[PDB]
Design a protein around this nucleic acid. Sequence first.
RNA 1: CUUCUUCACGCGAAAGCUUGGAGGUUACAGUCUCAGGGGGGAGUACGUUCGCAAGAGUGAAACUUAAAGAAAUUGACGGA
RNA 2: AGAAACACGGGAGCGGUUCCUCCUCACUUUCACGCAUGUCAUGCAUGCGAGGGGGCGUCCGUGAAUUUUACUGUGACCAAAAAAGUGCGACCAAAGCAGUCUGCCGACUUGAAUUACAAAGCAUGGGAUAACGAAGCAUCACACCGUUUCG
RNA 3: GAUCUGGUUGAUUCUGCCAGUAGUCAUAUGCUUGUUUCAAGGACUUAGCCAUGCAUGCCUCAGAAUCACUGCAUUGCAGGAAUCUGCGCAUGGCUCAUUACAUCAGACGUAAUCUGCCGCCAAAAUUUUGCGGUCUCCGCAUUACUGGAUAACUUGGCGAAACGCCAAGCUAAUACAUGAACCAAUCGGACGCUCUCUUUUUCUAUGUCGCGGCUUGUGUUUACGCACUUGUCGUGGCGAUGAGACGUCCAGCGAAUGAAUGAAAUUAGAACCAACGCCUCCACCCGGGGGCAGUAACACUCAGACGUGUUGACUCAAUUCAUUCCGUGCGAAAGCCGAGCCUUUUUGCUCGGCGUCUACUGACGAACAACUGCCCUAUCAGCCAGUGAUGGCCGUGUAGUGGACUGCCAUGGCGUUGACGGGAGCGGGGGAUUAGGGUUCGAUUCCGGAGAGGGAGCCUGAGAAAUAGCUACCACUUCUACG
RNA 4: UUUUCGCUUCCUUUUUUUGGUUGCGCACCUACAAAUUGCCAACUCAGAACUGCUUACGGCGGGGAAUCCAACUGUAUAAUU
Lengths: 194, 160
Amino acid sequence: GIVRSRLHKRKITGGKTKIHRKRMKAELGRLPANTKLGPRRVSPVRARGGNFKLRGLRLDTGNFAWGTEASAQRARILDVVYNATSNELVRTKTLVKNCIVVVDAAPFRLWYAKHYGIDLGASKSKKATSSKLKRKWEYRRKHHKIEKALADQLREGRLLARITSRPGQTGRADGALLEGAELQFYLKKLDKKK
Amino acid sequence: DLTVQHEKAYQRQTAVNENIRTASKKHVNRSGHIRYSKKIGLGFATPKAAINGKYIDRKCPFTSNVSIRGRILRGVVHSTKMRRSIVIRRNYLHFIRKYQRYQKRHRNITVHCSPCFDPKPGDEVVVGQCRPLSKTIRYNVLQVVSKSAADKMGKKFSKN
RNA sequence: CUUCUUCACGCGAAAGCUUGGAGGUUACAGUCUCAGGGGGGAGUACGUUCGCAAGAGUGAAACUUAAAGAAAUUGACGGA
RNA sequence: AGAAACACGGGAGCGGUUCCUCCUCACUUUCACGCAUGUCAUGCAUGCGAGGGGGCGUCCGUGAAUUUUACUGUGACCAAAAAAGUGCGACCAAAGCAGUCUGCCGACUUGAAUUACAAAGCAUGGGAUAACGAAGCAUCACACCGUUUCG
RNA sequence: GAUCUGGUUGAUUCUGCCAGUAGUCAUAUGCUUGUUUCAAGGACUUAGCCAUGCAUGCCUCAGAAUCACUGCAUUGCAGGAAUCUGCGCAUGGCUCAUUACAUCAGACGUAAUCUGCCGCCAAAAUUUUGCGGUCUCCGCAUUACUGGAUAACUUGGCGAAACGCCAAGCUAAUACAUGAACCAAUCGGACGCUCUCUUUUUCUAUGUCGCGGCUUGUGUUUACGCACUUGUCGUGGCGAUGAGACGUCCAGCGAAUGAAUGAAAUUAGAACCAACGCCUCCACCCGGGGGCAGUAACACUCAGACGUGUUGACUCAAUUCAUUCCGUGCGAAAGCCGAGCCUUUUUGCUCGGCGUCUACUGACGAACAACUGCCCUAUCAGCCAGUGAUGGCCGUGUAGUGGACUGCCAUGGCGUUGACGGGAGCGGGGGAUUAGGGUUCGAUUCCGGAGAGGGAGCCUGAGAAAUAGCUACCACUUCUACG
RNA sequence: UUUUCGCUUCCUUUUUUUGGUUGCGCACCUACAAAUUGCCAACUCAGAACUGCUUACGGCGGGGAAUCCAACUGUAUAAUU
C-alpha cells in the first residue's frame, strides 16, 4: 500500500530521510478511483476504522442547484464540458470536484416557469392554471433578472454547472450552475482553444 | 485582479455566491464591496487590504481558508524567492550549561503568507501555526511587524 | 632606537626576564588569535590537496618505549 | 504596557458622590400566578412602598470601534515519570507509613517534605543586551494648542 | 576522604610522562569461606539454532428441549454432552536487531482527524397483523402479530498423513430476516378545481370585509354558456378587495449537496411621497364620514412583542427552503428474574426490575504536528530539483492536514552556528563517579520508543501489517504407506 | 516659473532690449489599457491518448583488459614490404 508520509521525501537539506519501522497502515491510502460518466456502480467501502466512503464508478444525474435561484432540481448531468486540468480529462468524462458540466435545464425551466410562471421555448406546466397563479408572477415581477444566456442554455437544455462535492471521494457530484464573470471567462476559455 | 482573476482560475470561496439585491451608491465613488475578511483568530484584526482588497488566495487563511492556532512565532524574513509563501530565519543563542556561555544558533521556517501582505527578507514578522498548508508549511504569516507604525518616518526627512 | 646605567618588587626552575621584559597572575580572569599537549614510531605513510619542478600544503595509525627533556651545581676532563 | 478616544450591554451602580418637594409607606397598562412575616395552615391580615426627577465627579461587563506602546537578566510565582537521593525509632540495620487500643466488641490517627540545560507565562527591575536613532534635509527649507466662526 | 607516593641526577633544582593509588558492587575468573539477614542474576558473542515441555478464555438469576448423558424414586430448578449466542483475544512476556533531528524529552498542535469499550443521554410514521371479503383491492376489525436456513446430532463416507476431508439427513438462538405498530407533538413546503367571516356574557376575547363584472377580433358538440383583456366599467382598479377559511397534494425525525442565516460603531433635523400602526361622528354588528401616530390625545378589557448559539479564534455548531441518498427512520414480531390480577393457575389482563437495540456527546484512546533539545566525524561540504527538490496553482487521494499525490506553474529550498556524507549504541527517567568544577554510563526491571524468522504484502476488526493471524516470496525446517 | 524654447499683445525699465503678460507654437504618454482584437501562418519538437506486434526496406562503430614499438597528422619502395 501507499503511505501518506512526508517522510520518505528529501529532508530539505537534501538530507536523506530514512526508515524506522513500518509503512504504517493507518496512513495507507487508495489509488485514484474516480467515476466515469454513465451509470453508477458505487461502493460503500468500509473506510478508516469502519465507516463508509463512497466509491463511485460512473454516475449519471445531478441536482443542479441554482445558486442564484436557491432551488435545485434533480436532472441529467448531461455532460462534461470542461475539466480544468485536461482535455483528456474532459474527454474521459471522469468527474471531479469542480468539474464543469452541462445540464438538462428543463426542470429548472419548469421551475422558473412554475415559480414565476415563465419559460423560453416550451409550455408543459403553464396551462394547468382572478388568480393565485396571479401571484407567481407578481413575485417575479417584483424583481428578477435572470441571465439571458442561462435561458438560452435552457432552450437547448444544455446548461453549464460546476460540481460542489468531491466525487472521487464521495462518489457524487452535484453542482451548481457555473456563473457570471467566471462563466464569461469560461465561455471565453471555452471558445479560446479551437 | 488582472481586470479580475489573475491566475488561471478563480476560486470559489467559503462566501462568494452573490447577494444580488443591495445597490448601494458608490459612496465617494466607493462602494466597496463585501468580502470575506474576518475577526482574526485568538485576538486581532486583518488589514483593510483584505477587506478592501481584491486578490484572492486559498493558502491564505486570513481572507481565506486555513486556520491558525497554537504557537505564534516571530521571525526575520529570510527568503521570498518563492511566491506568496515566505521563509523566516530565527537566530537564537544557545546556551551551554557547562561553559556558561551561549553560542549563536538558528533555524529556518517556511510559512505561508496571505497575499495581502508584502514582506522582504529581513523583515520582522509574526507567524502562526496551522494545519499543514504545505509540506513545508504549517505556518502562516500573520503580521509583518514594524516600529512606531512607520519605522522612523519623522527623523528621515531627506535632502533635495 | 636605544643601548643601558640602574631599579622595580615582580616574575621565574634557573638560566634569566623591560618601552609599555617572560613583570604588574594558582590572590589564578583586559581582547582577538595561532599553537601546543610523554617519549619514540614519522611529520610518515601511493593519505590527500597545491605546485612547472623541486617539493610545499595538509597529515596518520600500526609498531615501539621509561624516558626524553631543561637549568643550575659541583665534579671530571679538554687535540681548551 | 496603560492611558487617551469612541461605542455598546449590566450602573441612586458593583462602588461612589451631588441638585430637586427627593420629602408622599403601592413600583405595573397588563403578564408580573413571586418574596418577607405570622397565625388560621395558603381561610384571614399586612406590605412590597421616598418609587421619581435633576446632577454626577463616577463604577462594572463588553464591543465591532479611534490613537499610541523593545530585550534580558533577576524576582517571584506559574506549570510535571519510577528515584538510591529529601520524610514516622520499622527491634533494628538494610526499612516504614504506620499506627495510638484494652485504655478501646472501641478511640485517636495516618502519613511532613523534595529538586535540573531547556518551558513558556507573569512581576519587577536596568545593570547589560538587539531593534532603531542609519543616515540631520521636508522642520525654516515634530507641524501645534487651540478658540470663536455666525464665514 | 577536595593529599598522594613510586619511578630520570654525580649531586642539585627542575619540565615531564609511566608505576602505584581510590572507586566502579560494572563483567569474568581464581582462591576461600560459620551462620544467618537483606539479592540482581545467557543482554553482552550470534536477534545463533531449537526437540522439549508449557504459556487467552470465560457465562450469570438474566439468548437457544432436544431426549446424548447426567441428575432425581420421578418430577426435577439444575446440569449438560455439546454447539449456535458475546466480548476480548491487537497490554503480555521477551528483546534492542533497528536509530539518529529520525526518535526520545520538555513542550506542543490536533479549528488537520479517526476513535470499540464508558459515563454522561436522547428520540413520531406506521403499512404490518388479523379478519372479512374482494380487486390480489376495498372493506372491516377490541388487532394482539410475524418470516426464512444454519450448529451441535444421526448416517453414510472419504483419507497414509495432516490444521486432511466430504456427503446427505435432523432441530434454536438477542446469529439471520421482516425489523412488525394500524394510537398521539408543537412543525415546513406546494396546488386549488374549494368555502368565504371561528366559540359567549350582562359590557366586554381574537384571528375581520371576500367583495368583481361587462367585454373587441378571437374560442364549445358549426345558432345557448364562461373567458382573454384590447377596450370598458365594478369594492381604487382600462383586465384579482386575496387576506381568512376549507380541502387537496408533497415527512417537517439521520446523512448529503446547494442556497441563506453569524456585533451593541455618527445622528439622521425633519420633511415629502409610498406603509402599517393608532385614535375620531354613529349603529349589537355590518356599515358609515374624520383625523392623527413629528410643534397635538385621554377612553369599550382600545398608538410602536415574546428573538444577540459556541472559542480571543471557524467555512464551527445550530435552523429554514430547495434538491438528494444502498448507515437511523433504534422507535420491538426475540431472552431472565420478581411480582399482581384474571385465570385454577394457565391463555388473558396488570405491575416491577434486566436483555437484542440507533443517533450525540464524553471520556478513552489512537492516529496525525512544531517550537525547543539530542551522540561521533571534513585528507565528509556543498546538498538539493528524472520528479518531488522548494514553493505556487485545481483537483485528487486519505480518517482528516499536507507534493501525501496528480495535473499545471514558478524557480526554489538547504548548508562554514558544518549542511551533505560518513561514525558510533535506540532515546529518555535515570545510572555511575568527581570538595568543587566535573568524567562516564545508561542492555536491563522507570518511561517512551523500537522490534520481532528474513523479507513484503493483505484481509478483518473500534483497533493491528497485528509474530503462540493470513498471503506469497528468501533462507531454513517436520512429516509422508512420500499423493 | 533667478536659464539661450520661440514669437504676438500688453505692462515695467530708456527700451519697439530683457523681465513680467497674453495668445499660439517649441521640449515634456503627463495622450499612457490591452495591445484586446483581425488576419494569416509554420512543420519542428514535444505531449497524450487510441491501437497492435514486427532482429524485418535502407542505410547501421564490437568491446574490454595489458606488453612491445613509434609522439602526433604527414611520407613511401610504380608492380611482394
